[PDB]
Design a protein around this ligand. Structure first.
Ligand code: FES
Ligand code: FES
Ligand code: FES
Ligand code: MG
Ligand code: MG
Ligand code: MG
Lengths: 576, 576, 576
């Protein structure tokens, strides 16, 4: 470890008696700080994604105060810094488009200001990855505090998740099976405490990825946003980041290729969102680890999903927490040759040393190896002429008889074409057809929306059929079922083969052999591709234009090309 | 109703251009208020019992902000006013001693300052009664906001209440049946969100009493302190109190003898704390309603306890809430000739009009009339030479074979004598003995502590016996079982017959006939009483002295004598 | 000093593993505190008089957060506790009546809860004395944080104080010499930042008394409530109180008879409010120091008033601060044999060691000894048959030719009689008359209002006469001029000789000889006194009744009799 005492980067702002420093120090003193706070003790930036418009993060200012208390206790100097908050439930066209913008803004807010370490206060879907991406591109000691999930929803005395019962309550408000005064009580019971989606959606998955990567204190992922112990862990986190600054325990020493592999296997074990694939690839591209879609494939194999939570299962995050949460799961991976046991965490201990003594307190929700939901619930990476740079599928959430399936393509040229055609009873489609949607990726939608879980055509569900093969260049909510191929790359909008799929074309899906094949000749594919031109709207100005010019494919994390890698934390030139 | 517009009492401070008013108005303007806020619109005092030392009320400042928003929306002028917070879990000798002091301080803070209406932000045990007592002695329009109970505690995957498992975890930390690192996780799971005790203890009972008296919006009692809908109800409350000021909807028009009777029957139906007896008698003595121990007896009869919650039952407040909470219970009392249906509430509607359409969503926790826990779970008032001014007992929590019981007295001269003798194996006591404790009432303890649920002597539980008859002048937690006689009045310390009970004396308890008899001659009782002198310590100064001089007996609510009644809201003389 | 480590009184609540302690500790943990905060480190109660209805204290919650940060830094456990806030600008009949009630409530909030030390967050007039009174009756280590004065008011480009220009702007709104839109800008400029009255009124005087008694860090009195350095001093105060708990630096070791004498001389040097006499006598009666009106007389002599501030002078608190504030003044008293130099302060250093090196930066506001306003600007204590227990007068604010004056009495039987008669042109009064007002003391007004600075009769000011001798049993604002005799004791309402003064009686005022004489025979005084009966209204219930029964005279500080003295900090009996 590094020498303590030493001159930290904040002392470039706050150390000495040159005119430069009495400007910086004397200005900050107008908020009323004792002079010894500028003596070179660690200055801790608390990066807070709280916003009134990101209700998933509604309690994060209370957590900031707990962090602050911990920094004070440990003799640091805490400064809260709000950062761009990309909420999935408010941002249009899709929060995924603004993740890279939050990451840019976080990076520059870190490097450009006198902070020595970082607490990443996160919660809603895209906050966790964008803060880790921006923090990783600076490589100052950083630690994640997770907001935590909402409590269980109870409407009429039954367990309702968040986003699950969106179908029944909209179907019933129009089909007259409930009042409007009945419907307002129903909505008020789905999201009834501060916090994130309480299924194994993107928020729960990314909190789990943060803890499994070792970037948060052990136990961080599953505490309800509203439990006392979430405040406790916030204050302990504030104590810890001061020591981490002294020791210079940097993210590049935590997010090693072995830690990413631990996260991949944890994603399998928890049945986590397919969004974690895109985000971990993006975070690794900031740290500078070589991580690929193929790493997701090889490390995901033969890891049973063990947590019995919707969508894949029965319970919600509350129960996952009361059973011991993510540590119990990490133990089991360690008891099976799947965990890299000696991976360093932010506590200074190894992941195995943190988890090895925890007890599973409800085997109904953290299942024994025998009663697991799937024996290989990792994500699979399909390749072929239709996805030359790769596509992903969650086999746990699929239908056995459709894992190997060939069928004829019904094509939707974009999201509007899909909504026009799907419910139309004139559409030529049966259950062996393969639904194919284009122009839904990063550049195409724009922003790669969660439209990949296309709803089946009404004339197909009338037969009592619940699943069909669907392919697109889009994403999918962590909450989903069905045999869905996602993140098809290159996306249609950049001229990938998926752009030139026509109705009637034969498509073969072969998951056991990781194959996804468009059954046309190489000549016909070549001539269809040479004829291609970008049919979607091209922005001419604004951030939309920037994203259109610079976003990459979901196969490498869908980052902006000029933002890949780590640019360090060197202090910039002085402003006077 | 009253005339609106009109000159409200705040305009004595803030209306006109006399020097008196530009002092008052001009000073308050240093916090930055537009001038039209002083135009005579309702000035709403938000009386907040939040404190860092009353963790039951930990989230009340967040609720104050929701109330404030509602007052703003409705065109009032909101001003937060902290008031004395008597927390049962911090205050020694007992929070009951400071309830009257909080009520005094609340009363004077209302009458002495320019507020036209009151929001009573309450939660922990004694806050609800002391704020209602002080507000009732002013009779300005007032409305109660309840903090709400803590979530269910889960330690190892089983439901633990608050205060229930205090026995097992202390027994096991010393008997070595769990680590110290195991014990710290256990404690951190008993009280794991902001709020009050989540059984049918004094806090849940007094929240229910407030709603049943109609002094809070319907649905107020059972929302977890931490549920979104508790904030919603806070904001609606802030809107409503502005209209109530305009209409002059005063507490004296809500807390009618019929409303108190509705509360008494609700206490029976919910199996509520015996503390509600003392508090409702105290609140009624401020409003000026004639309510007596006998009213508790007659109105409590033949009301089954229907809510299946500890101590009397199986579940906790969370489940009571998800089933529909107190409105469901008030409906059932209305569907049975037990409710005064036309009693006015603070909403402007009648109690029956508020509840009549609500649905019971879990009959396991709000039981049908057939499966009720007791068919007459009201409280009973015992009288006799031993309690000439009355004593109370909760028959639901008693043992059938001990409802009628005569036995010989084992006397404990005070609380110290009890702890010295109870575990001593030399003590002459069997299970037919009647345990009798003195000097535990208002003047005696001092403050009437919750020591009435005396623990049995170890040599008696060795036989597998769980209950004995106990008598004292003390109180009991809302959480309790056993055949216990409470609030024996006059207390021992003021020379009531309980003072002169000696070991070996025959005592008869006869609940069906409301009898509690000390079997000695009237001559022997007279000569024992003439010999009496006050053996406990007499304070010479401080608040303890004031309480010693002026507190009355638990039979009339244990208020201070010079604080009984309503002194109105007349503006006092001007300070210059 | 005392042993550190040791078991502090909070460990009676939070130390061990008995059931008693897991109740207390486990409950407080619902706000989310790490377990080691209960390890016996100092628990610091931050007693906060903030209220939306005490605008003088409007920024005190921000200061509480600065204190909290300091307690955290020093390894204590900070808990904010709101206390009763007696604001002079809102409370009717007068905040003086509620000072003893705030002191009672503060005392019991300290002794009854698990705090080891106290930060007294104060500001508006009566907050400082009531918190010191309550804290002194417990004698736990305590330290004062002062809110600070408002900035200078500027209306039209001239310096206006707070309360000074109340005459001109009310005279002009009715005499048409300004618009109503002009008048609203004028009021908005008198009180234009958060803080207390910015003259040498009661708030500035009591802040100065706290610093001179050594109960606040040096420099505490004069920082504008709104200056950055007031937040700095709050945080330093939070650091310091943790050490003070460890060292057991108690108020009884700071408020020695020598410290009170230092305050008396400081009051003279600053030309402080006559209210400080009543409050210091009250505080000393809690500590148990023998301090008397005579101590005020002897120690006040020959101390020139040096601070050039209204009412006695030209500038306001802002300028007093920029010149060095109270330390500069304490130095000068030390450079003149007037200071007890070795008096201990809360910093651990002596008062002289704190101040001895400070520099006077504006001798226009802290005057040299030559240019002083008065050479003996202490307060004088008059005695005689008319004030047998004493009366006070500020000679600086008097008229030289009226210091020795005999005249005939014009009597006002109470405050209502005065307002009825004073402006009536039929009243038999010239400038040699001595105006005498009764029934304005503690029991009489009730509450001893600031009505002693009676306005002269219009027919007297028409001659260009600005001063007349006035006598009453009332108080006076810190802001005042004129030859006024105050705090006449015993007050009229308790049968003091002032009760039986009749029109035409000769009264002699002789300040140089400390004499105030009612020129009637001892026989006529005796028979007038035997005929006396209490003509004012007697309260029958409520706090008014309590005050009527128990308040004493202004000659001993006007405390409640049963609240005099120190009752210690012994932990009370356990509540279960
Ligand atoms: S919307 Fe924020 S967690 Fe799903
Ligand atoms: S201690 Fe506050 S609710 Fe029981
Ligand atoms: S009114 Fe609060 S300082 Fe004068
Ligand atoms: Mg999402
Ligand atoms: Mg209780
Ligand atoms: Mg004053």
């Amino acid at each position: 470890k590094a020498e303590w005492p030493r001159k930290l980067r904040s002392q470039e702002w706050y150390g000495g008696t040159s005119r430069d420093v009495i400007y910086h120090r004397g200005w900050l003193k107008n908020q009323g700080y004792p002079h010894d706070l500028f003596d070179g003790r660690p200055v801790i930036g608390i990066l807070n994604t709280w916003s009134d418009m990101t209700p998933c993060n509604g309690h994060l200012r209370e957590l900031a105060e707990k962090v602050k208390a911990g920094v004070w206790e440990a003799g640091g100097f805490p400064l809260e810094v709000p950062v761009f908050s990309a909420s999935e439930n408010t941002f249009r066209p899709t929060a995924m488009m603004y993740r890279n913008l939050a990451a840019l803004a976080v990076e520059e807010a870190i490097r450009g200001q006198p902070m020595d370490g970082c607490v990443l206060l996160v919660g809603c879907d895209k906050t966790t990855p964008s803060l880790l991406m921006g923090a990783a591109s600076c490589d100052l000691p950083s630690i994640v505090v997770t907001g935590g999930p909402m409590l269980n929803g109870y409407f009429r005395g039954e367990r309702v998740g968040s986003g699950t019962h969106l179908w029944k309550f909209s179907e019933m408000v129009k089909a007259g099976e409930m009042t409007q005064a009945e419907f307002l009580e129903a909505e008020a019971s789905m999201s009834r405490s501060s916090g994130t989606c309480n299924t194994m959606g993107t928020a729960s998955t990314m909190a789990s990825m943060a803890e499994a990567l070792g970037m948060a204190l052990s136990g961080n992922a599953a505490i309800p946003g509203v439990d006392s112990r979430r405040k406790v862990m916030a204050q302990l986190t504030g104590r810890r980041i001061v020591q981490m600054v002294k020791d210079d325990l940097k993210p590049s020493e935590i997010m090693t290729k072995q830690a990413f592999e631990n996260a991949i296997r944890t994603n399998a074990a928890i049945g986590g969102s397919t969004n974690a694939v895109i985000h971990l690839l993006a975070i690794a591209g900031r740290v500078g680890i070589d991580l690929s879609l193929d790493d997701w494939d090889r490390c995901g194999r033969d890891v049973p999903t063990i947590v019995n939570l919707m969508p894949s299962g029965k319970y919600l995050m509350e129960e996952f927490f009361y059973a011991g949460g993510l540590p119990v799961v990490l133990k089991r991976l360690g008891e099976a040759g799947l965990l890299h046991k000696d991976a360093l965490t932010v506590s200074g201990e190894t992941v195995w040393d943190e988890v090895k003594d925890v007890v599973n307190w409800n085997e109904d929700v953290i299942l024994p190896a025998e009663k697991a939901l799937t024996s290989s619930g990792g994500i699979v990476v399909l390749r072929g002429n239709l996805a030359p740079k790769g596509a992903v599928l969650k086999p746990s959430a699929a239908s056995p008889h459709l894992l190997v399936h060939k069928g004829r393509a019904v094509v939707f040229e974009d999201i509007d074409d899909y909504k026009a055609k799907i419910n139309d009873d004139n559409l030529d489609i049966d259950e062996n057809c393969i639904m194919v949607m284009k122009n839904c990726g990063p550049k195409g939608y724009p922003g790669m929306a969660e439209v990949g879980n296309m709803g089946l055509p009404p004339k197909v569900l009338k037969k009592g059929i619940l699943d069909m093969v669907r392919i697109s260049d889009a994403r999918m909510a962590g909450t989903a079922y069905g045999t869905v191929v996602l993140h098809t790359s290159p996306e249609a909008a950049v001229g990938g083969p998926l752009a030139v799929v026509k109705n009637g074309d034969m498509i073969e899906l072969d998951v056991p052999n990781r194959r996804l094949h468009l059954d046309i000749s190489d000549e016909e594919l070549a001539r269809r591709l040479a004829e291609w031109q970008p049919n979607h709207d091209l922005p001419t100005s604004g951030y939309a234009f920037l994203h259109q010019q610079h976003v990459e494919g979901a196969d490498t994390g869908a980052d902006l090309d000029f933002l890949k890698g780590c640019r360090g934390n060197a202090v910039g030139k002085d402003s006077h």
